[PDB]
């Protein structure tokens, strides 16, 4: 489901909330990328079990199913952490609570009429092309 | 507290909340938006406030439990659609 | 209708045949009614009285001239045509209902009594005590008129079906 690399950097700083300070790690975003001299190698090594670099409808539906898999996994992780926090086995992390309530903030609305209208309109256009 | 489904806040609702008559709820929402606390818009022909955002703050354990319950419901929905699609597309998953 | 060649003509037949037609109309079996009319010969529809009367009642009931249907009560070729006139009045009341709850907005008490030819005013409560179209609002005969979310799941099913028939090998 995830990249094999998770990256951290050490930060000691007076916490703004006044909780006692100790030397602990902080996350730094990670990615996997390659120079061309290494793409020529990874491509050759993986050519046997490669996936076509083009959207075959089956592959795209597979991609969406995998996306749902991943969304479920992440939501389960968030729920487990929140349950632990509520029952008290873990302390509260204000950064995590901030991000979660911002996610909920960003949830969209679909029952709104001038969105159902637009969705139907563009669905119909797409299906005329189909 | 209000979820996005009906996050439309009515002026009468605001007035029944913090006690101000409804001719300066416009100014209250004005200052709220100006300070950067709540984003959105005011549609006062029908007397409503579309809040599209809120200054995230530090919550309590009860509020975190509320969020956990909402995550549970959301996960149930996601898993249901996940199963439906995977069951109806079983023959075209590579 | 079967042993026609052998059987001698029975003048005492159209009575029961038309009475059967009346029974079909009584139990609202319009399909069977017209099937049996078709079975009948052509002339009898316009010549005989015993058959013409049930034919007339059905024609009126389909047109919607319920007043003519009622006024036909006195006009009965033979008294045998009985108890099916009564079941027919009951079925007519049911059909009038059907109309009322399918396409109206609200009918007050006096107008309901006027339209639905109920029993005496005291029993006029009938068919509301029986069918009960959620009556009650404001005036008890407010008729409670018996008159937007994306079907995401169904659309997903159909689109996946397109993909399935497009990607399967055949």
From Swiss-Prot, chain A:
Covalent cross-link (Glycyl lysine isopeptide (Lys-Gly) (interchain with G-Cter in ubiquitin)), residues: 50
Lineage top rank: taxon: Eukaryota
Modified residues (N6-acetyllysine): 74, 84
Other information: Does not bind a metal ion.
Purpose: Component of the 26S proteasome, a multiprotein complex involved in the ATP-dependent degradation of ubiquitinated proteins. This complex plays a key role in the maintenance of protein homeostasis by removing misfolded or damaged proteins, which could impair cellular functions, and by removing proteins whose functions are no longer required. Therefore, the proteasome participates in numerous cellular processes, including cell cycle progression, apoptosis, or DNA damage repair.
Subunit structure: Component of the 19S proteasome regulatory particle complex. The 26S proteasome consists of a 20S core particle (CP) and two 19S regulatory subunits (RP). The regulatory particle is made of a lid composed of 9 subunits including PSMD7, a base containing 6 ATPases and few additional components. Within the complex, PSMD7 interacts with subunit PSMD4 through their respective MPN domain. Interacts with TRIM5.
Entry's family note: Belongs to the peptidase M67A family.
Protein name (database record): 26S proteasome non-ATPase regulatory subunit 7
Annotated gene: PSMD7
Curated annotation (Swiss-Prot), chain B:
Keyword presence, S-adenosyl-L-methionine: no
Keywords, comma-separated and alphabetical: Acetylation, Proteasome
GO biological process entries: meiosis I; proteasome-mediated ubiquitin-dependent protein catabolic process; ubiquitin-dependent protein catabolic process
Assigned GO CC terms: cytosol; extracellular region; ficolin-1-rich granule lumen; membrane; nucleoplasm; nucleus; proteasome accessory complex; proteasome complex
Membrane-spanning residues: none
Alphabetized GO MF terms: structural molecule activity
Subunit relationships: Component of the 19S proteasome regulatory particle complex. The 26S proteasome consists of a 20S core particle (CP) and two 19S regulatory subunits (RP). The regulatory particle is made of a lid composed of 9 subunits including PSMD13, a base containing 6 ATPases and few additional components.
Sequence similarity: Belongs to the proteasome subunit S11 family.
Function: Component of the 26S proteasome, a multiprotein complex involved in the ATP-dependent degradation of ubiquitinated proteins. This complex plays a key role in the maintenance of protein homeostasis by removing misfolded or damaged proteins, which could impair cellular functions, and by removing proteins whose functions are no longer required. Therefore, the proteasome participates in numerous cellular processes, including cell cycle progression, apoptosis, or DNA damage repair.
Protein name: 26S proteasome non-ATPase regulatory subunit 13
Organism annotation: Homo sapiens
The organism's taxonomic lineage, starting at the top: Eukaryota, Metazoa, Chordata, Craniata, Vertebrata
Residue numbers of the full-length protein present here: 283 to 376 of 376
UniProtKB/Swiss-Prot annotation, chain C:
Domain PCI, chain residue ranges per copy: 1-151
Lineage: Eukaryota, Metazoa, Chordata, Craniata, Vertebrata
Organism: Homo sapiens
Gene for this chain: PSMD8
Placement of covalent cross-link Glycyl lysine isopeptide (Lys-Gly) (interchain with G-Cter in SUMO2): 122
Domain of life assignment: Eukaryota
Signal peptide positions (record): none
Described function: Component of the 26S proteasome, a multiprotein complex involved in the ATP-dependent degradation of ubiquitinated proteins. This complex plays a key role in the maintenance of protein homeostasis by removing misfolded or damaged proteins, which could impair cellular functions, and by removing proteins whose functions are no longer required. Therefore, the proteasome participates in numerous cellular processes, including cell cycle progression, apoptosis, or DNA damage repair.
Family: Belongs to the proteasome subunit S14 family.
Name assigned to this protein: 26S proteasome non-ATPase regulatory subunit 8
Quaternary structure note: Component of the 19S proteasome regulatory particle complex. The 26S proteasome consists of a 20S core particle (CP) and two 19S regulatory subunits (RP). The regulatory particle is made of a lid composed of 9 subunits including PSMD8, a base containing 6 ATPases and few additional components. Interacts with DDI2. Interacts with TASOR.
Covered range of the whole protein: 176 to 350 of 350
